[PDB]
Design a protein around this nucleic acid. Structure first.
Ligand SMILES: [Zn+2]
Lengths: 204, 369, 126, 286, 54, 121, 240
RNA sequence: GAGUCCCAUAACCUUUGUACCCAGUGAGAAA
RNA sequence: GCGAUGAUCACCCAUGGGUGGGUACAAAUGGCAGUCUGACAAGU
RNA sequence: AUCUGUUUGGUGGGAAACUCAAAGAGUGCUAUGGUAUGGUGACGGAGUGCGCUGGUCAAGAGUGUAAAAGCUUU
């Protein structure tokens, strides 16, 4: 959208350049495709609607990132230790999954582990199969840092510390919105992730 | 003797110099027929002496049309006058191998000292250089030859058929298919705006039910106010100021956020009805008879659901889905509308007069009942 | 259209039947006789005893096909190009070729018998 | 493409000679880039000149056959065209010289009242004719003096002559005792070669355009190629289908040999049998 | 995978034993073992014609 | 080139109209523009006759594209009034179609008219 | 109409069979989400989430090449990386199917002479980028010799009596050696005075006279009366 | 230890509110 | 003062209502529908 | 069900590789001396003369004709 707002037309692209969009290596490709192309030439009365749509979706993404700013702000003002541990939008869809923050706080840590994967969980319980291990908590950055079966392992330890921090946030009264319990819990999860990424199943 | 060779191609013109003649009498034999497939032996026949590239796709299309209808263009004149030696016109002309027996006369009309050959020997020399292509040219052209071929084929075809992008019904297909999308987007977004402002006072969605009018008035009211003069765009405005006096519902950051949300709804609301005006105009220039008969938005949805103006045209009249006496006016309007769409598609730059006559006919039929 | 072979031509000249007129009063229809290049190769390979037969096969009324294979085995060529297409009458007097042709179905067979041509697997002759 | 540009029912008898021309008319201009010209004599006392529509240049865009009909009182037996100046010569009951403008012979150049069976013009020193008469005679004519020059009588009958295109006074005769004779025009008292390997009467001879070898078709149904300095056959070509090769030419490529037999067929051969006609990379050429 | 073959393993049996589903259909004699690469797909009848194949 | 291009001259027009009348008697003619396009997309049609003088012309020019798609001969008669009179109905028709039939007593005539209008086209 | 099929690869590369209780010849869709001539489609969900890719039913009563495929041709030369020169691209009916059989890495040059079919060809070649529409007469290949280079298969769905000359000219210009020549011969449109086997035999003889060795012919009888597909290869030296 | 990234951010059913219904044909229609 | 440029073709009352079967849209703290295990593991 | 007993369905060489060799097929790469650099002071460069190419004009000659014109001309 930003590039068609910038140039508009192919001969206009032949006379203009751009570096704030499309970084430094697709320029020769768009210029060669501007020189030779199977595309027609548009008029101004529909280039105007093309430009209106392009500025429309540019402003749409501006609204998207500022709504994400609002979500980050309300989340770190409502349950900030969960933000310090698992992150803003992950904790947000945890809370939005379980309904209330207190209804998520009074659930055990195993539930917070498997919280997104209910259909896989209950089919793997109603026939005697193996249950999932990730759920909605798979998209946390720590589980992203883990690799192998120990992302199941630190999904478990991350759900345990997230239950700790989450019910602290929901049940505290002298809470300070400063991330202290979430930060010490995150340090615990990070050095645990370190000590099980340091081991290796090879023999040296 | 086949001394020089002229290969036309989308990137420009090439003059090759024939080094070794191929066999004339043994030209149908197996080894002579597959030496033009082997590249290691074709390069013993043909050597590139010149390549004049084109100035762009405009001169490419000009020279494609001139080569197509068998005329020598100015770039051809330039490269042939550069490359071919000034032979005599009465004794031992220089021999140029072309692939077009009616381009030959245009070459001798300009250079009388050039006799042109396009028989089977020149044909398989030409298809040898076509078969190998980029390898003969030793790296001296800009642009990949097949990419220029795609561009030149599309340009040649649209020129030959007179493809106009004004009477291009894909614009109105995508315009109405996007307009329905933003109908439901403005609907759900202003529904959430009314929901988030429902706990500031839940009567603005009772007095002012239209989504755009609600959103634009709540973009500037954020409080009580009193001073109810510029809120009439005043019985509803007076009732609204009375309700603001009798406020009966419950921030700052959340209220700033729902102000940004209502500004988003207003931006969608005036990009719609810009798009609607655009597609009424595009429908008048693309389908004037259909839009005279049943209207611009209805004709837009008609050719969208049909898939194209051509598909709505070539459809039978008894199989048109337009949207007793009330049951058979649909059939009358259907076959008149199919007639109007046929007129409108296959006329090249249409008028409005037959849409007018069919509108007169269908109003006469409905007024008869 | 009728594919000729070499012993049919030899028996035509031995029985004094014209090719196109014998075909016409055999079938009571207009015939186009066809000499394949392998039948012509076989007549040329027959030597200088068969000069009369070769320059009666060289006749502008007898059209001629262009077979595309190696070797000059006319029985193989006639059998292949007739079982490919089924739009051909085969005029022959070889016993083996007559048995091949009358074993493949839908192919009429013409042959010099007596003092005129006869036709067998064509069910509309009168 | 091995296919005829045109056919022509030219005469009623045997067409006993034919050659090709660039007819120097002095009223019209010859269009040799789209028309080819062949003229041809027969035993029905006619020489006819024909034009052929030829697709070799694509310069132009047409009244093909029988542009004129020369007429003699007796039959003709051979014909050959001068390589300039609109002239040809026809042998028959007597040898006449003609040009393409006049409808009658310019000169009768006959030694005695004995008929002439064959004719060839020289290729360089183009004004020297040679002819074979049925009294076993080979006669040379000169067209400066407009007269015969010298004749020899051999044992048997010379069927054909061809001049050496690279030596201009040497010719080869092909005669009925089964061998060919390489003769010097300046001394006809001895052949300077005899090419011996045929077993029946030699019908036609021709030179390579390189002047280095000859081709020689005979009445035994076979043709033979001879190196010019040896005197025995370098190669023999035969076929069970080829009968009585009456005409042989050596194509101007010097690589193919055209033979006309008497079953009807005209066949191409390679002069060097083991030699293929593709272009060659330098490793295979070396 | 076998995890998806254990979900579409029944209608592949139906397609293998097509010939005895309707007493009037009478297919041509193939064997049709389960192909190594397949894909299960749903027919989109479009929004052009109604009521016939719908 | 006009829009209604492959028009027939007078002899071909009367040959066409005579076989149109005989097919209309033998129930082998579907007459009218949308019946013609119905039988054209169904594939039961041997050739389509459009009249080159109705009050719009694109109203039946929609049919040459269909005939081209399905390789059916199409021919332009210069009188809608004479075409309707040949069709045997009391109104002018602008397009008609000869449906295919092999129990048809005019198959040779239809094939001859098809050959004539296809060498025209 | 809303049923479920199983897609399975055919013997021919690039085309598929959808088995249900009636099985369908099916190709992948190069422009997903719309139908070109009203055929039905099949949408599979192949496994970032899985993506809905879709497939188009090839109708043998509206495509001579599909009638040939499902009558059984031993070798099509239309293959998933190739270049096909479609002659007589009468609309986008079969050219769309040839286009998405050939795939995104191959090119279909769709030659057509009429102009309203050409307009529909260009509007179809927008959403199928691997189609080069060429609006020109195929009887003069020099008029578009600049736009096309070195095709791998020619397909000929022209319906003219000078068919074999058109096929020979386009092959000698643009086809490569041992490339494919697929012909759809319509007997009644060549000539109707002789029978169908006579005109097929004459057309095959014309092809080998223009040195295209025929490998295979198929009558394609339940879908078209008196049609044929002749599949040959451009031998260029030595049909023997 | 342990099947989610393969739509529990989902699918289907039920209920409740809002807008409708219960194509082909091919020469008749009117008096 | 017609027409192929198309004629024609679910239950209850003395235009209007009553009763419901399908269509789409939206909603539901309506349903399916029930939130894994539990004490060892890694190293020297 | 210490009823039943039919049907359907199951039960009843391999692995590794930045290893070592032996071969086959296809594809890619200017893969280019039709007789190899401009030149062993025997050489090169400059200039002159001869040679060569093209168009123009003039003359000749043919052919044509009342005269022509035109056309042809190694
Ligand atoms: Zn043969």
């Amino acid at each position: 959208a930003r590039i068609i707002l910038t140039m508009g037309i192919r001969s206009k692209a032949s006379e203009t350049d751009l570096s704030e969009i499309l970084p430094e290596e697709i320029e020769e490709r768009v210029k060669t495709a501007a020189e030779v192309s199977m595309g027609t030439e548009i008029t101004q009365t529909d280039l105007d609607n093309i430009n209106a749509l392009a500025e429309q979706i540019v402003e749409f993404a501006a609204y998207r990132e500022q709504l994400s700013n609002y979500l980050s702000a309300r989340m770190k003002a409502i349950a900030p230790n969960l933000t310090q541990l698992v992150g803003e939008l992950v904790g947000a869809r945890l809370i939005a999954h379980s309904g209330s923050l207190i209804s998520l706080a009074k659930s055990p840590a195993s539930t917070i582990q498997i919280l997104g994967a209910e259909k896989a969980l209950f089919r793997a319980l109603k026939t005697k199969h193996d249950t999932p291990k990730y759920g909605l908590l798979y998209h946390a950055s720590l589980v992203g840092q883990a690799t192998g079966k120990n992302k199941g392992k630190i999904a478990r330890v991350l759900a345990a510390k997230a239950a700790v921090s989450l019910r602290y946030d929901a049940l505290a009264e002298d809470r300070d919105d400063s991330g202290d319990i979430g930060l010490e819990s995150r340090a615990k999860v990070e050095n645990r992730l370190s000590q099980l990424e340091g081991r290796d199943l090879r023999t040296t | 003797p086949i001394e020089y060779l002229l290969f036309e191609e989308p990137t420009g013109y090439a003059v090759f110099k024939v080094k070794l003649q191929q066999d004339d009498i043994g030209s149908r034999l197996k080894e002579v027929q597959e030496q033009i497939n082997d590249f290691g032996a074709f390069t013993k026949l043909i050597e590139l002496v010149s390549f004049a590239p084109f100035k762009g796709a405009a001169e490419a299309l000009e020279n494609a049309n001139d080569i197509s209808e068998g005329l020598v263009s100015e770039s051809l004149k330039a490269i042939l006058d550069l490359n071919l030696p000034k032979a005599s016109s009465k004794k031992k002309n220089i021999t140029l191998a072309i692939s077009d027996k009616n381009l030959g006369p245009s070459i001798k009309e300009e250079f009388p000292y050039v006799d042109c050959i396009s028989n089977e020997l020149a044909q398989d020399l030409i298809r040898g250089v076509r078969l190998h292509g980029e390898k003969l040219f030793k790296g001296l052209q800009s642009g990949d030859l097949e990419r220029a071929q795609l561009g030149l084929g599309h340009a040649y075809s649209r020129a030959k058929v007179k493809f106009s992008v004004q009477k291009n019904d894909n614009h109105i297909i995508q315009a109405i298919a996007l307009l329905d999308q933003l109908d439901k987007d403005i609907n759900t977004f202003a529904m959430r705006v009314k929901e988030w402002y429902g706990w500031h006072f839940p009567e603005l969605a009772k007095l002012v039910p239209d989504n755009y009018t609600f959103a634009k008035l709540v973009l500037f009211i954020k409080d009580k106010a009193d001073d109810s003069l510029h809120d009439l765009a005043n019985e509803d405005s007076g009732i609204a100021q009375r309700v603001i006096d009798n406020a009966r519902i419950s921030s700052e950051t959340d209220m700033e956020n729902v102000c940004v949300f209502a500004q988003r709804v207003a931006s969608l609301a005036d990009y719609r009805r810009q798009l609607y005006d655009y597609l009424c105009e595009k429908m008048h220039t693309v389908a004037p008879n259909l839009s005279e008969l049943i209207g611009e938005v209805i004709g837009a949805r008609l050719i969208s659901h049909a898939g194209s103006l051509t598909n709505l045209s070539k459809q039978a009249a008894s199989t048109v889905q337009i949207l007793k006496n009330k049951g058979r006016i649909s059939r009358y309007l259907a076959n008149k509308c199919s007639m109007a769409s046929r007129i409108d598609n296959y006329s090249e730059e249409p008028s409005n007069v037959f849409g007018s006559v069919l509108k007169k006919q269908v109003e006469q039929r409905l007024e008869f009942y | 259209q009728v594919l000729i072979d070499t012993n049919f031509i030899n028996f035509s000249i031995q029985k004094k039947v014209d090719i196109v007129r014998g075909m016409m009063d055999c079938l009571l229809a207009k015939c186009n006789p066809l000499i394949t290049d392998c039948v012509m190769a076989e007549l040329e390979k027959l030597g200088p005893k068969y000069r009369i037969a070769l320059k009666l096969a060289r006749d502008p009324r007898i059209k001629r096909l262009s077979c595309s294979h190696k070797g000059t085995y006319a029985d193989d060529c006639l059998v292949h190009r007739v079982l490919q297409h089924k739009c051909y009458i085969v005029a022959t007097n070889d016993a083996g070729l007559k048995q091949r042709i009358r074993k493949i179905p839908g192919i009429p067979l013409m042959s010099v018998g007596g003092h005129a041509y006869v036709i067998e697997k064509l069910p509309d002759v009168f | 493409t091995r296919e005829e540009f045109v056919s022509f029912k030219a005469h009623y008898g045997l067409v006993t000679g034919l050659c090709v021309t660039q007819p120097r008319f002095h009223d019209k201009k010859p269009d040799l880039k789209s028309q080819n010209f062949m003229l041809s004599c027969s035993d029905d006392k006619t020489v006819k000149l024909w034009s052929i529509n030829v697709d070799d240049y694509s310069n132009k865009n047409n009244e093909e056959g029988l542009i004129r009909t020369f007429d003699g009182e007796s039959a003709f037996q051979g014909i050959d065209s001068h390589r300039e100046n609109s002239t040809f010569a026809t042998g028959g009951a007597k040898i006449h010289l003609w040009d393409v403008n006049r409808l009658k012979p310019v000169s009768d150049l006959s030694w005695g009242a004995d008929n002439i069976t064959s004719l060839k013009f020289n290729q360089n020193e183009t004004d020297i004719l040679a002819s074979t008469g049925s009294d076993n005679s080979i006669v040379l004519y000169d067209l400066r003096t407009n007269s015969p020059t010298q004749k020899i009588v051999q044992t048997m009958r010379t069927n054909a002559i061809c001049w050496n295109p690279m030596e201009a006074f040497n010719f080869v005769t092909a005669n009925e005792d089964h061998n060919a004779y390489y003769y010097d025009m300046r001394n006809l008292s001895r052949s300077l070669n005899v090419f011996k390997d045929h077993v029946s009467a030699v019908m036609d001879v021709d030179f390579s355009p390189t002047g280095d070898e000859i081709v020689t078709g005979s009445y035994d149904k076979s043709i033979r190629i001879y190196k010019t300095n040896h005197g025995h056959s370098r190669e023999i070509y035969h076929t069970k289908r080829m009968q009585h090769v009456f005409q042989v030419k050596y194509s101007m490529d010097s690589k193919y040999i055209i033979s006309g037999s008497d079953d009807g067929n005209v066949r191409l051969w390679r002069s060097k049998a083991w030699e293929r006609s593709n272009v060659k990379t330098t490793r295979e050429k070396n | 995978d076998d995890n998806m073959r254990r979900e579409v393993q029944r209608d592949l049996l139906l397609i293998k034993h097509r010939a005895a589903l309707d007493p009037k259909r009478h297919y041509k004699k193939q064997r049709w073992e389960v192909p190594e690469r397949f894909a299960i797909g749903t027919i989109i009848e479009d929004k052009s014609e109604f009521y016939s194949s719908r | 080139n006009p829009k209604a291009f492959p028009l027939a001259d007078a002899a071909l027009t009367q040959q066409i109209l005579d076989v149109v009348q005989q097919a209309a008697n033998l129930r082998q003619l579907k007459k009218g523009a949308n019946e013609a396009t119905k039988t054209l997309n169904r594939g039961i049609s041997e050739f389509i006759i459009m009249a080159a003088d109705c009050e719009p012309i694109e109203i039946l020019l929609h049919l040459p594209l269909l005939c081209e798609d399905k390789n059916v001969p199409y021919v332009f008669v210069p009188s809608r009034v004479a075409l309707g009179r040949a069709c045997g109905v009391s109104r002018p028709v602008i397009a008609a179609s000869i449906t295919t039939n092999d129990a048809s007593a005019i198959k040779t005539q239809i094939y001859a008219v098809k050959d004539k209008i296809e060498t025209l086209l | 109409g809303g049923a479920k099929v199983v897609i399975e690869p055919h013997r021919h590369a690039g085309v598929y069979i959808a088995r249900g209780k009636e099985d369908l010849l099916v190709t992948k869709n190069m422009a997903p989400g719309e139908s070109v001539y009203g055929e039905k489609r099949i949408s599979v969900e192949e496994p970032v989430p899985p993506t809905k890719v879709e497939y188009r039913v090839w109708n043998p009563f509206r495509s001579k090449l599909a009638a040939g495929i499902m009558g059984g041709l031993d070798e099509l030369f239309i293959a998933p990386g190739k270049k096909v020169l479609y002659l007589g691209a009468a609309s986008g009916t079969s050219v769309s199917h040839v286009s998405d059989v050939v795939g995104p890495e191959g090119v279909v040059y769709a030659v057509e002479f009429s102009h309203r079919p050409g307009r529909e060809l260009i509007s179809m070649a927008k959403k199928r980028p691997n189609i080069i529409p060429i609006i020109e007469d195929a009887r003069h290949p020099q008029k578009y010799r600049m736009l096309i280079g070195m095709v791998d298969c020619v397909f000929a769905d022209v319906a003219q009596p000078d068919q074999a000359r058109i096929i020979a000219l386009n092959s000698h210009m643009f086809l490569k050696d041992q490339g494919g020549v697929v012909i759809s011969i319509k007997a009644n449109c060549i000539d109707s005075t002789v029978d169908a086997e006579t005109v097929f035999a004459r057309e095959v003889q014309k092809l080998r006279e223009e040195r295209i060795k025929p490998l295979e012919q198929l009558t394609l009888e339940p879908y078209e009366r008196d049609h044929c597909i002749v599949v040959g290869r451009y031998m260029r030296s030595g049909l023997k």
